[PDB]
Amino acid sequence: SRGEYVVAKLDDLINWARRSSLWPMTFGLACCAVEMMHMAAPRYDMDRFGVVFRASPRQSDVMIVAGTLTNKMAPALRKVYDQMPEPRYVVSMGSCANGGGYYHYSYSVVRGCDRIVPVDIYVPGCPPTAEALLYGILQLQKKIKREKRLRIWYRR
Amino acid sequence: TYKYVNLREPSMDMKSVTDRAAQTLLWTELIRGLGMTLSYLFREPATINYPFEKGPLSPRFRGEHALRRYPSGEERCIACKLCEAVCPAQAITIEAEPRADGSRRTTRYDIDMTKCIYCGFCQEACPVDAIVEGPNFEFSTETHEELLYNKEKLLNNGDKWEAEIAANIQADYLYR
Amino acid sequence: MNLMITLLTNFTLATLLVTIAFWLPQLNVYSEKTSPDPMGSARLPFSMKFFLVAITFLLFDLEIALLLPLPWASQTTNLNTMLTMALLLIFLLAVSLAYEWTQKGLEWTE
Amino acid sequence: MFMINVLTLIIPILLAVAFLTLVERKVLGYMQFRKGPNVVGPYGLLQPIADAIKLFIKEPLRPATSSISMFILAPILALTLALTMWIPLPMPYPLINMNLGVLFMLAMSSLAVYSILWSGWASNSKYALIGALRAVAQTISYEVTLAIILLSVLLMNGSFTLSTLIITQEQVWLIFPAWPLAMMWFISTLAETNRAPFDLTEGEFNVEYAAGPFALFFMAEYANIIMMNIFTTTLFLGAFHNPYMPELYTINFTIKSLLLSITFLWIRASYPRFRYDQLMHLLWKNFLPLTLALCMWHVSLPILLSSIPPQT
Amino acid sequence: VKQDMPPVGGYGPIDYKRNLPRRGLSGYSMFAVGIGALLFGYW
Ligand SMILES: CCCCCCCCCCCCCCCCCC(=O)OC[C@H](COP(=O)([O-])OCC[N+](C)(C)C)OC(=O)CCCCCCCCCCCCCCCCC
Ligand SMILES: CCCCCCCCCCCCCCCCCC(=O)OC[C@H](COP(=O)(O)OCCN)OC(=O)CCCCCCCCCCCCCCCCC
Numbered sequence: 001s002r003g004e005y006v007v008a009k010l011d012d013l014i015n016w017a018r019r020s021s022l023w024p025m026t027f028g029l030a031c032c033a034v035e036m037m038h039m040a041a042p043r044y045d046m047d048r049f050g051v052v053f054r055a056s057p058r059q060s061d062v063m064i065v066a067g068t069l070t071n072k073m074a075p076a077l078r079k080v081y082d083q084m085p086e087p088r089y090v091v092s093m094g095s096c097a098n099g100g101g102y103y104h105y106s107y108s109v110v111r112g113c114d115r116i117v118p119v120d121i122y123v124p125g126c127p128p129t130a131e132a133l134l135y136g137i138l139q140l141q142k143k144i145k146r147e148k149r150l151r152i153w154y155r156r
Numbered sequence: 157t158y159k160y161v162n163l164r165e166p167s168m169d170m171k172s173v174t175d176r177a178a179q180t181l182l183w184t185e186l187i188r189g190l191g192m193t194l195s196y197l198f199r200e201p202a203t204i205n206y207p208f209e210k211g212p213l214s215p216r217f218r219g220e221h222a223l224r225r226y227p228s229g230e231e232r233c234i235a236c237k238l239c240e241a242v243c244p245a246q247a248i249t250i251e252a253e254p255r256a257d258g259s260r261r262t263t264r265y266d267i268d269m270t271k272c273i274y275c276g277f278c279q280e281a282c283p284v285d286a287i288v289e290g291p292n293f294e295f296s297t298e299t300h301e302e303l304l305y306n307k308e309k310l311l312n313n314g315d316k317w318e319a320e321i322a323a324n325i326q327a328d329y330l331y332r
Numbered sequence: 333m334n335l336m337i338t339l340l341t342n343f344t345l346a347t348l349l350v351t352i353a354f355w356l357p358q359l360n361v362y363s364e365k366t367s368p369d370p371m372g373s374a375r376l377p378f379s380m381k382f383f384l385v386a387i388t389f390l391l392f393d394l395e396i397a398l399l400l401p402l403p404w405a406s407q408t409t410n411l412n413t414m415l416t417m418a419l420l421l422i423f424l425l426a427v428s429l430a431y432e433w434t435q436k437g438l439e440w441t442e
Numbered sequence: 443m444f445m446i447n448v449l450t451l452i453i454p455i456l457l458a459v460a461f462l463t464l465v466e467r468k469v470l471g472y473m474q475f476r477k478g479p480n481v482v483g484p485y486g487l488l489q490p491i492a493d494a495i496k497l498f499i500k501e502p503l504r505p506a507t508s509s510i511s512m513f514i515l516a517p518i519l520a521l522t523l524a525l526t527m528w529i530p531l532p533m534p535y536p537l538i539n540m541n542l543g544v545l546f547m548l549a550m551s552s553l554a555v556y557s558i559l560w561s562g563w564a565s566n567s568k569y570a571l572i573g574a575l576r577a578v579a580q581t582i583s584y585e586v587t588l589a590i591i592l593l594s595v596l597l598m599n600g601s602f603t604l605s606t607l608i609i610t611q612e613q614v615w616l617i618f619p620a621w622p623l624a625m626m627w628f629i630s631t632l633a634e635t636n637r638a639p640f641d642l643t644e645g646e647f648n649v650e651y652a653a654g655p656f657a658l659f660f661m662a663e664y665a666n667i668i669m670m671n672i673f674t675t676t677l678f679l680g681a682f683h684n685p686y687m688p689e690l691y692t693i694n695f696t697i698k699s700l701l702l703s704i705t706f707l708w709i710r711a712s713y714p715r716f717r718y719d720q721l722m723h724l725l726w727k728n729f730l731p732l733t734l735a736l737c738m739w740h741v742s743l744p745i746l747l748s749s750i751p752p753q754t
Numbered sequence: 755v756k757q758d759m760p761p762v763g764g765y766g767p768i769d770y771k772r773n774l775p776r777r778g779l780s781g782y783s784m785f786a787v788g789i790g791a792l793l794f795g796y797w
């Protein structure tokens with residue numbers, strides 16, 4: 001129909017603006033912060049994708065959980081997650097954020113950050129390289145590109 | 157065998173005093189900093205065009221795991237569980253039995269890719285080059301359990317990447 | 333009249349942009365947020381130094397207000413008196429600054 | 443017809459502020475041995491459009507405001523004062539040609555701290571209020587040397603008329619008789635707009651605003667940056683004006699103001715931040731004594747040389 | 755044997771000291787250029 005075409009083009013517009021202007025808040029927990037700092041370094045350069053370097057946690061669009069989540073900091077992670085405006089996304093970077101990793105059987109480690117926050121992209125590695133993290137960010141952009149918020153709103 | 161950083165007593169003749177005061181009043185080192193930043197403005201940047209251009213890797217690179225095969229179709233894993241005894245993360249779960257022709261073969265070969273520390277002790281502990289840690293690093297998933305590989309996923313990674321894995325092992329095996 | 337139209341246009345554009353910023357994303361039916369700082373709940377401690385730099389601003393801005401007719405005052409016929417009083421005003425501003433210095437008024441915001 | 447002239451002033455201000463963000467990210471990219479944005483548009487040209495559409499559909503941050511009214515008025519006042527600083531600017535003819543355009547700009551820039559102060563008090567955070575008081579004290583501090591340097595330079599102009607300041611500089615740029623006033627002016631206007639190395643709002647006040655109103659504060663701040671570079675260009679680097687071809691002056695002051703805005707972008711990618719007391723020390727103990735001494739010199743100097751400029 | 759080794763004469767010399775090349779005029783010359791710019795502006 002006509003309105004279906006309108007909500008299709010508006011979904012394309014707002015998904016374009018949301019994937020082409022991702023603002024990340026990176027939790028620099030552990031060694032994966034070093035490789036995020038390489039994904040911001042000149043070779044890979046997140047900023048040329050519109051992915052800025054270190055937005056504040058209240059204007060950021062995606063939370064990159066880069067490192068080991070312990071039991072002592074998991075409520076702070078959930079607090080920063082709850083304080084993000086929607087649409088908010090979570091990239092889990094590295095094995096400790098994904099599933100506990102090398103500290104999986106530890107007494108003081110949350111076995112994956114997905115016990116705490118809903119995770120969109122799981123980026124595997126110890127650490128995953130800056131190229132692999134940039135792959136995960138572009139896969140997040142492709143996930144945003146196929147969102148159907150207004151088409152489902154029009155069909156409800 | 158040692159040196160003194162910042163132990164320079166400055167000169168007090170009118171030449172050096174007026175040099176330091178001209179540096180204070182005319183901002184010489186600030187223009188030196190602006191000159192260095194302006195020098196990098198006209199350099200060619202170091203940015204590669206990902207995904208079209210790729211970062212350089214070596215044949216030793218430790219990425220996604222793969223169970224290999226001999227050059228007849230027979231799989232190399234003879235169910236010996238050295239890769240899970242050596243595994244620092246206990247990411248490898250192995251269960252075995254004799255199959256229908258009497259070969260010592262696995263039925264369960266799981267790797268939890270979210271426990272794995274990607275250190276490659278499994279490929280260097282493997283006596284028959286069955287488990288390798290191949291060159292794929294672009295395998296991010298959208299769900300946690302898609303990073304929980306069974307034997308089918310790992311043998312499919314072997315069949316998927318063997319044309320590359322065999323050449324990397326061919327380039328590196330005389331260092332091993 | 334052109335200036336009043338210009339001021340009204342700029343205020344109307346600013347109010348239109350502020351209304352779009354405060355009401356266009358309100359139409360998002362996202363979610364109700366449950367339970368929406370370095371100091372927790374302590375009172376704001378009064379800083380004497382912030383008030384001191386504000387009053388020093390106010391007094392030197394008054395001395396600036398005395399200095400502001402100088403591009404018109406250079407046109408006078410009584411130039412010796414004008415030059416003496418101009419140098420005396422800038423000198424009294426400098427004496428205010430020197431007294432603010434030497435009695436430790438410019439400290440920890442120097 | 444005058445309304446068309448007001449629109450052709452205020453809409454290209456917004457467009458140049460929109461693309462100044464792209465120029466900042468690109469110039470800071472290449473000065474950091476990387477690139478700036480080049481994926482979202484052809485050569486990155488659609489990055490500010492994408493970012494504006496992103497911010498205007500982001501969730502409102504929904505703060506508990508102390509005063510609702512001042513929380514609304516601080517972006518309104520910031521944008522209104524950011525737009526009204528352009529109307530006496532002679533390029534080569536201003537929108538509002540007035541006899542006291544310099545003093546008008548100094549007044550409307552003195553009024554700009556109420557937006558910072560009202561945004562700081564209208565937030566319930568005491569930390570945001572402390573940051574707002576620091577930013578207001580910083581800005582009102584450097585307004586002192588703005589006023590005195592500006593007075594000392596206009597002692598060579600004869601009036602507060604901005605259009606007379608082009609006639610003043612037809613034989614020489616006014617930076618040649620007044621380069622120490624120029625360099626202290628340039629650092630003081632760098633400290634007016636909370637711009638690096640004087641950006642203690644980013645170093646560890648409007649953090650409770652949603653993405654829309656924070657974008658409005660951001661664009662008012664960049665309108666102030668472009669405007670103060672244009673005002674510094676007219677004030678110290680006055681271009682040639684042929685009255686039969688005004689576009690010569692317009693192209694010339696545009697090139698000079700673009701170079702000066704890039705010079706702001708080039709300062710912010712070169713130096714670390716001051717500590718708060720260090721730029722207070724820079725104002726009250728370095729810039730203000732030389733500013734007063736040069737004010738005495740530029741009072742007494744047209745009298746001792748017989749170079750008093752005309753009143754009209 | 756075949757092994758990663760330095761070449762037969764070794765490598766060349768590698769610089770490792772501070773090299774800040776001391777550019778610019780003297781302070782006398784910098785105040786001279788500044789005062790000359792002031793005098794040209796005043797004239
Ligand atoms: C308009 C176009 C641009 C104009 C030029 C500006 C472009 C260059 C910008 C460079 C980057 C700057 C980044 C921010 C830097 C802030 C810090 C800084 O510089 O602080 C200023 C510093 C501060 O001092 P300081 O901190 O460096 O030194 C230590 C100071 N104490 C001891 C107090 C701690 O210097 C000044 O304040 C100088 C201001 C300008 C001086 C002008 C003097 C002119 C010459 C007068 C005559 C001299 C001879 C004697 C008389 C002769 C008579 C015949
Ligand atoms: C009645 C029906 C119509 C309903 C209303 C809609 C009116 C028109 C709205 C704009 C156009 C809508 C379509 C949006 C794009 C859809 C196609 C798309 O996504 O193309 C992708 C392409 C880039 O491909 P990408 O996926 O980014 O690849 C990465 C690099 N290989 O993307 C590109 O090449 C760039 C896409 C740019 C999108 C358009 C430009 C921005 C929007 C301008 C208008 C709105 C804003 C106006 C000004 C705001 C303030 C400045």
Ligand SMILES: CCCCCCCCCCCCCCCCCC(=O)OC[C@H](COP(=O)(O)OCCN)OC(=O)CCCCCCCCCCCCCCCCC
Nearest residue numbers: 012013016454457458460461482483484485486487488491
């Ligand atoms: C004073 C001057 C100020 C200038 C400000 C702006 C500067 C930049 C101007 C724009 C420069 C070019 C921009 C091109 C954007 C990318 C367009 C594009 O390629 O979109 C492709 C997309 C998908 O198309 P599709 O059919 O799927 O393609 C498959 C092909 N087999 O299709 C789409 O996305 C749909 C088409 C979208 C078109 C959007 C065009 C950009 C609009 C920007 C706003 C400003 C317009 C210019 C204003 C000044 C000039 C009047």
Ligand SMILES: CCCCCCCCCCCCCCCCCC(=O)OC[C@H](COP(=O)(O)OCCN)OC(=O)CCCCCCCCCCCCCCCCC
Nearest residue numbers: 333335336339343515518519522523539540541542543546
């Ligand atoms: C909290 C409330 C909302 C806050 C946001 C909005 C308000 C703040 C931002 C706007 C500030 C407005 C400033 C208005 C007056 C500025 C001074 C002025 O007009 O100077 C220009 C000019 C003097 O130059 P001259 O050349 O001498 O005059 C022409 C004759 N030759 O003089 C003229 O040309 C005179 C022209 C006729 C008289 C104009 C009177 C204007 C209307 C009254 C003031 C409007 C603002 C009131 C509220 C201010 C709040 C700060």
Ligand SMILES: CCCCCCCCCCC1=C(C)C(=O)C(OC)=C(OC)C1=O
Nearest residue numbers: 460463490493494497656657658660661
């Ligand atoms: C409708 C006219 C434009 C409205 C304002 C939105 C676009 C300009 C500001 C956006 C912005 C950009 C581009 C930006 O790059 C940025 O990061 C440095 C911001 O946050 C501090 C911004 O707010």
Ligand code: SF4
Nearest residue numbers: 031032094095096127
């Ligand atoms: S997944 Fe491994 S390398 Fe990455 S942050 Fe964790 S411990 Fe460090």
Ligand code: SF4
Nearest residue numbers: 233234236237239282
């Ligand atoms: S992969 Fe290698 S080390 Fe592991 S059980 Fe099989 S044969 Fe043994």
Ligand code: SF4
Nearest residue numbers: 243272273275276278
């Ligand atoms: S790379 Fe290391 S942690 Fe991963 S499966 Fe092999 S031995 Fe285990």
